Amino acid sequence: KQYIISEELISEGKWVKLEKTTYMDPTGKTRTWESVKRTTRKQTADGVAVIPVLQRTLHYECIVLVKQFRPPMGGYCIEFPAGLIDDGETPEAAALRELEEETGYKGDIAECSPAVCMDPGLSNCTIHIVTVTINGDDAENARPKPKPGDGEFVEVISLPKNDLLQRLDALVAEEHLTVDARVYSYALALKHAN
Amino acid sequence: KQYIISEELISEGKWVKLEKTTYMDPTGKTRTWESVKRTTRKEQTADGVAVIPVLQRTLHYECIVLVKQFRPPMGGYCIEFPAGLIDDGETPEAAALRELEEETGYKGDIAECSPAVCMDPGLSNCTIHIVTVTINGDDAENARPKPKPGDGEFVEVISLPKNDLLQRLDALVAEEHLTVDARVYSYALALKHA
């Protein structure tokens, strides 16, 4: 019933552009929206986010997260490891590379989502959520070597999966950080299950 | 260590703006970023709310109540948690219960309310509270729920069992052109992983 009529460029930066979208509502009334898009997509999606399950025998399973200064937020955020998918990369492979660059961990693909939207009221940004287990007992993950590209400054924070939500709430209360909504959603459902 | 130096307007719409952010990196070097922000945020603790609505009924498996809407930024239909912006002076909890009723017809009870969490911190400053609400579907008020959408809001309600949410979401994605929201997918993945 609904569809895009036209998109007017309002402003293009190097990384992000702003558009005026004209669309047909289900009545037959023409309406407008202000949309954002990244200029970097071709791809299955703009990016990947990695859910990295760190498994070490005789330890709690942990979820590996990253803390970074985020200039749109003017502050530090706690997120799943994540980045853009390179021209001609599969989402799986983008996931293992990002996880290594950002955390030093080398992991295994467990499962891969379809393309899912980041903030559909605002942007067309999409990611694949890639679940990855990390054999924390293998020698290659013993002393993880993070390989951060230019201008990435990443702190690695591992939290137990079985208490994820309480541990994040504690970091927020103590450290003036913003947790990522996907992280929080995941943490919430771990408590809401069963 | 890192902090904002300046924020320069590039382009302001009625609803969304684009800014050039200058910040200090942890090496002591100036860098820039392109930041999106919504024009509607005032004194709220966040831009919006998303509602995790747990529909409870005697002799029924618990359902998660979701909404399907056309999203002009995406050029297509998206499956999301019920959600909207927080009105000036409104509490996140009030916004949540109101949005939930407007979009779905259901009258919820507050369970919990997150701190403000970021939607896409590499792109925007946009934040929400994620509000978990239970719906007593045995209450006569919630028997034949009537949406009360606002102007230009066109919503379909989809209720899926919590105990099979991820497979049911995948089935819907198999049947049509539609994108699942990343928070919904994250929550569904955690329910499997638990």
Ligand SMILES: C[C@@H](N)c1ccc(-c2cncnc2)cc1
């Ligand atoms: C119903 C009407 N008051 C309205 C119309 C469009 C929008 C909007 C939101 N985000 C991006 N672009 C446009 C908000 C409100």
Ligand SMILES: C[C@@H](N)c1ccc(-c2cncnc2)cc1
């Ligand atoms: C590596 C460095 N040239 C760089 C710097 C900034 C960004 C960026 C991304 N999204 C929005 N705004 C800015 C991407 C890359």
Ligand SMILES: [Cl-]
């Ligand atoms: Cl897992």
Ligand SMILES: [Mg+2]
């Ligand atoms: Mg990253």
Ligand SMILES: [Mg+2]
């Ligand atoms: Mg990266």
Ligand SMILES: [Mg+2]
């Ligand atoms: Mg809404």
Ligand SMILES: [Mg+2]
């Ligand atoms: Mg609404």
